[PDB]
Amino acid sequence: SSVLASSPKKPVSSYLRFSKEQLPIFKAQNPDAKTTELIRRIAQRWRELPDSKKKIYQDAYRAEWQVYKEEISRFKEQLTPSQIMSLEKEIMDKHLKRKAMTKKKELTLLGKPKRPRSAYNVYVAERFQEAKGDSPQEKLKTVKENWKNLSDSEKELYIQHAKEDETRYHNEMKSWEEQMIEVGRKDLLRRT
Amino acid sequence: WAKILEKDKRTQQMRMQRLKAKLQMPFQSGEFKALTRRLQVESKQMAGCLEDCTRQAPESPWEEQLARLLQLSGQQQRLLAFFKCCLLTDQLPLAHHLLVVHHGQRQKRKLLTLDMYNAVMLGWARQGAFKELVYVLFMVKDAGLTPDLLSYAAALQCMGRQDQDAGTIERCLEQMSQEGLKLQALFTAVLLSEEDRATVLKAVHKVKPTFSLPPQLPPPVNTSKLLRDVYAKDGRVSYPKLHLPLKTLQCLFEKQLHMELASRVCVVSVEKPTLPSKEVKHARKTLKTLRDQWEKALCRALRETKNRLEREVYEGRFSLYPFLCLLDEREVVRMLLQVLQALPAQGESFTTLARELSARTFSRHVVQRQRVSGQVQALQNHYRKYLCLLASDAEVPEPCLPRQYWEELGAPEALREQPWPLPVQMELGKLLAEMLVQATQMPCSLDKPHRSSRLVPVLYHVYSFRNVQQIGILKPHPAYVQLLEKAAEPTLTFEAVDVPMLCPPLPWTSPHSGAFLLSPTKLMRTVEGATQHQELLETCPPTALHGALDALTQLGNCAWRVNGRVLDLVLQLFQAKGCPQLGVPAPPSEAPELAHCQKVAREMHSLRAEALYRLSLAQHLRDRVFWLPHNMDFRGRTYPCPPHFNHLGSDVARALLEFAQGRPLGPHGLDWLKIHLVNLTGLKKREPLRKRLAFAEEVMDDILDSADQPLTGRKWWMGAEEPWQTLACCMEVANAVRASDPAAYVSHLPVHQDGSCNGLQHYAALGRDSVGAASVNLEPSDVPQDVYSGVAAQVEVFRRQDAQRGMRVAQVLEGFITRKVVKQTVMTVVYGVTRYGGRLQIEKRLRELSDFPQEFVWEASHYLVRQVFKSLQEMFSGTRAIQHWLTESARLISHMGSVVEWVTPLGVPVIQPYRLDSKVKQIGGGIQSITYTHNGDISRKPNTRKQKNGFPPNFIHSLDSSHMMLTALHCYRKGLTFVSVHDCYWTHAADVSVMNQVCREQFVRLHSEPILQDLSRFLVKRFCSEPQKILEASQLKETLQAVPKPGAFDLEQVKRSTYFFS
Amino acid sequence: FKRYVTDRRLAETLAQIYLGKPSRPPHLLLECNPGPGILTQALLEAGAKVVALESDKTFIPHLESLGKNLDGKLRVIHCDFFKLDPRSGGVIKPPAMSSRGLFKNLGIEAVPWTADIPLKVVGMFPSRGEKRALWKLAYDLYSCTSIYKFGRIEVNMFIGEKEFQKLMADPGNPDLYHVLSVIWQLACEIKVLHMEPWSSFDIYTRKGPLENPKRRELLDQLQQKLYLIQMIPRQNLFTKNLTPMNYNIFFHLLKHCFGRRSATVIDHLRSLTPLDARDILMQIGKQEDEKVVNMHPQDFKTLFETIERSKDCAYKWLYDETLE
DNA sequence: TGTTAGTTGGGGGGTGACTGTTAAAAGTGCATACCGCCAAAAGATAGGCC
DNA sequence: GGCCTATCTCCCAGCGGTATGCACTTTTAACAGTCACCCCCCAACTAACA
């Protein structure tokens, strides 16, 4: 029901299928072992073996390429220009999704601002376990109602903790921007 | 809270481990290169040196130094310009980053050259930093390029600046011996600054305290045959002096410096005021608010472009980042706004605008660099010491020419930058043009602003179609044009170069250093073949060009002032409807089937803008003294540097200008003033001098009436051929006669002397033709001779005999052959016969007279030229032989693949700029792909059609220039003011006798030398002394040795000719 | 490099297709080049009159030899059809003439546009510069000058296969679609009457009737096929918006659009007009992603009239006579 | 000076990553052939082709 | 060498846009056990944009 190649079955490449099928073999031979060395053994095996198996796997992959060609031909007979436009739109959406995932991974793996927790955020982080409820949303609602019931006298300590965490965040932020100038993420600075 | 803080600490330490790993990990992954990263400071054989010694980093940076450490593609020159600009912009880490990125890749390492490493080595020669210099040395040896003198100079500068151990420098200088690198070669003939050689001297003095450079004190003297007398110590000489005192000339220099440091001059308009409102204030307010909005938009766009191109410089790509940091933002935006203001309603081409924007940026960079350095103060000191020779009440111990005094004093080097390569100029201009189009935005409906909220561009990109081809032009929105015309601007703006100087211009000491104080100006103003002329000029021996440089300096030293009495009358006509027959253009609004009325308004709207500009500039300089610099084209013809307010032009241009220093008339000056008036009248052209003077005495009352009442009177001066000059002479003669003493009256009015056709005079002198030397006035006679009458008679005879055949062009022209059209035809045939272009002018006269049928003009002109050509063949003898020989030599030289080259008798080399079409290259982009001819292409070959029909007039042009230069240089020693305007010589009325002597004697001394035979012996050495292809050399040798025999005419008789120049 | 008809069967079928049975036989038929002859005899035997227009004076005796009868049916005149009303200034040599004098001598007068056809022209196009001849005819048609000042004249000339294919093209075969096709398909009604190979026609040069027999082998080496075209101008061409005073702006718009073919209509309208392009293209009933290639000629006319009809704005165009 | 939006924490879910062979998409920067005729004078000459 | 063919003023002035082909880099989806995205109002912040 999808124009993209996910809905049909795409043939895995013959050499690629060899490297794929050797992985469970050495997974079973070496249970709970790291695949870091399993794939290295697979690559050593592929580099050591002669080119005749590569040639016959080329012939097999050529046959699968011909059957994939006729599948794409009948699909194009089934396809419409509106379906081509929808396919292009799905490709652009996939590009946007992978760009967003990549930039989020770059933000998380590298140094990232974790902005300070407010007074209510500190109250939630401290007193969430004490509250009792059937569902977590009910627990958050009870914590929110209790926080609204709290007076400013008890809230002064939470505001002080929020201010201290703001100070540590600001210092960590100057250190992070200095370190990231040392790393060179010119996009990861304040604009002004 | 303890657990959350502990988890935060573990993640934080993990991030420190990640950042230490990133600092440790080499940048070998392209996905990381896709992101903007830090600056980088640190094959099988290429990486052999860097693999070990860099890893075990030396504790002592002085070790591993130099030898102890043991035509371009078009893209490469862009990288070289990038590094050379990063030297000036103080961004060495950026250039180092790009260099290491290009060094890492195998595809990008090939196009790097030794100069690109040497630029960075010189960049870190300053400011110390042994580490980076050692790293660049490692990279150079990885590439394999053996180091040169400049690398050793950079290392010496570094150790001198950091003042490290002298034993290490002595070890460095025990190296570089046993090799050919001589030490004195560092200090001369290598382009490095004075601070660089000072630091190298500081190093060498600690190494070798006995190292002294050779002084080379005395300069040489020209000592050629024709220029021996002007450079001779034994003689009596009285050099002229300016009338103003030293303090005034000291104050004018500051005004000129303040005018040239800024790049603009604002001049009040001479248009009639519009002080009544008539809703011009609404337009004026809308202009202001829009022009501030555009300024803010341009600043924002510039900052965004710079922040994008910096990221483009990162990730290892070339871009134009250092070029946009060469100037401040406000100056770039101001230049763009000035360019948008001076935009015609029709629009201009994209490539023209682009170029304009690139040239202006380079000029402002050159001017600003001298401000950030100290050359301005040195120029002030040298100028104030120099002004003693050119001023009154200030005496020099010995008399000498201004160039000799300039160089006798210690002169600053005044180093200048080499020009940018062409692709960088084109891309920078295109980028700024794109910014201008995509930044400016304007309301759609201006009459009703609240009704519409749509925003449209100011400038539109459109195509103009001609034949198959399309030209992309930029056109303003018509509402903007209507708004501009509806408001009245009280101010026009000029550049500093386009305005006359307010101080004596700087002397000509070299083909690069010259007229303007800070702006750069070249001797030869040729776009075609621009590099070859300059290379020939810098190649020649140093003493060759003193005559031309001294003559140009003398022409530049002349002081000028404005004749305001003529100016008042001209602007009186200008502000009214005006009179178009005298020369003042009428307004387009007065003028009125639709296409005709559209075109007639267009042409006068074209002319009136130029008239307005000249009149406004003249009113600006109404009460001031000013100087006009000069230069020369490839033929030797001398032209002023300002484009429109040069003293050349029409009658109204020459009427407003006169001398600033006055000399008494003497016993005989007033007779010369009367003869000049009769000469400008246009009558009595066939009469002796005494008849002219008697006629002037008979028309005394008429000239007095024309002087006292110019417009209300009988209007005699309008009937003259050139009215305004006649009016000026009328005023001067009236003031002279109404004085008490006719002598001892100071006159500031130029007097003109000119031959009929100097080309024919030079042909007659070369061939020694008796008939020609009688036809033009080289033989003494009591009555003048006129060539144009004889040519007109011969053409009339040929036309009359052709008319009987029934040819239409012969019989249509009856009663129409006049002196003026014959004059224009002869001037076209003799001078500027290259690619016949006076035909248009030849058309104009035939169109101007009303009796002629207009539709027959096009066939008529093409006829007339042929006839006069034949006439000039019939009358003159030596002209035929000389033209035939020059044409044949040009043909046979051009067939061999060589452009025509020769040397003037004064030592100036001349080469011809005619070549076939070059390979045109294109630049792609967003708005448009642009195409440009690439100058200096080797594959260009001679154009035989243009290199054949060009040789005979160009040689005569060079002879004209030589004669004028000799006359100027020999009139300087007698204390005379000399000006050269077109074919005319201008001098004060008192001295026109003695000048008339000199102008004859030099003509006898230039033509007493083998002009033709020296060509015969020089062209064979230059062209016919090659053994590579003797097949055509054997044929060309005879015609190169075939010089026409002279006739029977005594040249010395020209000394006694009294109508030779009249 | 000229050609005529010298056979008898081909002259016969051309004579029969030139004149239809309902059409009036005394309707004046102008032959743009009779040549040596042969064809004109067939036209005389058909029954209609002839006005002969021969460029070369050399044939003028033989053409005068026929028509010894005083009926005036032959009426040979010396001029050239394509050099009629020369725009370039100069003396009108006997090959060049003015349409006014020629049609005064013929005795023909003016007839309004919404009326029956005055004349009929048979002839042939030049071997080189068919584009230039078609462009000059279009300039004479859109602004009523030269021949087209009096009534609504047809032409029945011959054309080559390349120029024929470049004309009459549309979306569907999109590659050859260009400006001259649009202006001719709006200007008149086009039909095809007859097609022949080039070998049937004679071949002629300046020295004589072309004697090279291997030039027939060059004719087969080119293998060019010739078409006969009927071009009858349309009655409703001159709409209130598209007038003889407004035709140059239409030509500029077409040349601007067919320059930079791959772009959309909106992108070109951004340069052409200050008004909104989305409004115009939704008003005519079409979409933004449309290319200029797949746009029919009547939508080009409708676009021009839609721009022209608006009276809200003072400035609707960026074409002044400066661009000329 | 007024308006925007994405982070800071909540849990469950699905969805994609870290270890890697395969082998072709896929992207860049050049060089070059080919459309457009927007309509338009006469004569002498030089080059190119047979 | 001899016949015939193509061209000309302004130097200014310069032409743009499509489609094809070819030496070279990068660079991704396919399989999976198991931990990162993304959500939710609460309020606050607030740098950034207009």
What does this structure look like?
- Chain C: It is found in: Mitochondrion.
- Chain C: Its main location: mitochondrion.
- The complex is a heterotrimer of chains A (192), B (1062) and C (324).
- With 192 residues, chain A is mostly helical.
- Chain A has helices spanning 14-29, 35-48, 51-78, 81-109, 119-127, 136-149, 152-183.
- In chain A, helix 5 packs across helix 7.
- The longest helix of chain A is centred in the C-terminal third of the chain and has 32 residues, at 152-183.
- Chain B has 1062 residues and is mainly α.
- In chain C, helix 5 crosses helix 7 (179-187) and helix 7 (179-187) packs across helix 12 (297-309).
- The radius of gyration of chain C is 22 Å and the shape is globular.
- Classes of the chains: A mainly alpha (192), B mainly alpha (1062), C alpha/beta (324).
- Chain A binds a DNA duplex (50 and 50 nucleotides) through residues 10, 12-24, 27, 34-40, 42-43, 46, 61, 100-101, 104-105, 108, 113-121, 124-125, 128, 135-137, 139-141, 143-144, 147-148, 162, 166, 169, 190-192.
Question: How is this structure best summarized?
Answer:
The complex is a heterotrimer of chains A (192), B (1062) and C (324). By secondary structure, chain A is mainly alpha-helical. Chain A has helices spanning 14-29, 35-48, 51-78, 81-109, 119-127, 136-149, 152-183.
Give the tags.
heterotrimer, A: 192 residues, mainly alpha, DNA Binding (I), subunit A, 2 domains, 7 helices, C: 324 residues, alpha/beta, Rossmann fold, Helicase, Ruva Protein, domain 3, 5-stranded parallel β-sheet, 3-stranded antiparallel β-sheet, 12 helices, globular, DNA-binding, RNA binding (chain C)
Largest beta sheet of chain C: what is the strand line-up? 3-2-1-4-5
CATH evolutionary superfamily of the largest domain in chain C: Vaccinia Virus protein VP39
Structural class of chain A: mainly alpha
Tell me the overall shape of chain C.
globular
Protein name (chain A): Transcription factor A, mitochondrial
Modified residues (Phosphoserine) (chain A): 13-14, 19, 118, 151, 153
Keywords (chain A): Activator, Disease variant, DNA-binding, Mitochondrion, Mitochondrion nucleoid, Phosphoprotein, Primary mitochondrial disease, Repeat, Transcription, Transcription regulation, Transit peptide
GO molecular function (chain A): chromatin binding; DNA binding, bending; heat shock protein binding; mitochondrial promoter sequence-specific DNA binding; mitochondrial transcription factor activity; RNA binding; sequence-specific DNA binding; transcription cis-regulatory region binding
